[PDB]
Amino acid sequence: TVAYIAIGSNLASPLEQVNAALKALGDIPESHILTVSSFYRTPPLGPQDQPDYLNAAVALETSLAPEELLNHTQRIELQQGRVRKAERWGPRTLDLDIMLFGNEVINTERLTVPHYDMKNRGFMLWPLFEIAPELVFPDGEMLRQILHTRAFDKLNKW
Numbered sequence: 751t752v753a754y755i756a757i758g759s760n761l762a763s764p765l766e767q768v769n770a771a772l773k774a775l776g777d778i779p780e781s782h783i784l785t786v787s788s789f790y791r792t793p794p795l796g797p798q799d800q801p802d803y804l805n806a807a808v809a810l811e812t813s814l815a816p817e818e819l820l821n822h823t824q825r826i827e828l829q830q831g832r833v834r835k836a837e838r839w840g841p842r843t844l845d846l847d848i849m850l851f852g853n854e855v856i857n858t859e860r861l862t863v864p865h866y867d868m869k870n871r872g873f874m875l876w877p878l879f880e881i882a883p884e885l886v887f888p889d890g891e892m893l894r895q896i897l898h899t900r901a902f903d904k905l906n907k908w
């Protein structure tokens with residue numbers, strides 16, 4: 751299965767954190783990274799007076815079940831980040847969000863796939879569009895169409 755995962759951090763110097771996370775993603779059992787997007791420097795969604803976030807998207811090949819994948823991404827978040835990643839409008843030490851999981855639709859207590867707000871977040875959509883410009887969601891929506899419809903500002907690279 752190809753899972754698409756969003757990475758964000760707004761540590762002041764986030765490259766080492768983001769690399770640690772990427773390495774951890776690759777080390778997940780029965781999984782490996784297919785592709786990584788460029789790293790983007792994005793203005794905070796929330797209070798403007800925190801550092802900018804580094805956002806990226808990753809394609810991960812996996813034979814884990816979706817909730818097993820989430821178990822790992824949450825583990826990585828605990829091991830690599832702190833309860834900065836939990837302040838509601840930031841800062842965020844490290845978030846890992848499962849955007850898509852194959853062509854599955856998931857709505858459980860633990861998981862909402864496709865991700866619950868990605869269609870409102872250019873910082874999730876643009877890096878995804880870099881690595882998967884032809885992406886079609888399970889319901890038939892097209893990533894390209896969402897970006898065209900909403901006109902979200904293009905992102906600057908880190």
Ligand SMILES: CC1(C)Nc2nc(N)[nH]c(=O)c2N=C1C(=O)NCC(=O)NCCS(=O)(=O)C[C@H]1O[C@@H](n2cnc3c(N)ncnc32)[C@H](O)[C@@H]1O
Pocket residue numbers: 757758759792793794795796803804805820823824827837838839840842845846847848849860861862863864865866873
């Ligand atoms: C502060 C805010 C909004 N602003 C940002 N501005 C910029 N430029 N860039 C950012 O990356 C950025 N991130 C933000 C932010 O808060 N991001 C994380 C976030 O939304 N957290 C609240 C939602 S959450 O389900 O708890 C996220 C958390 O739920 C878990 N999770 C992962 N995938 C999931 C899924 N598909 N369904 C359900 N849970 C999943 C995981 O622990 C994740 O951190």
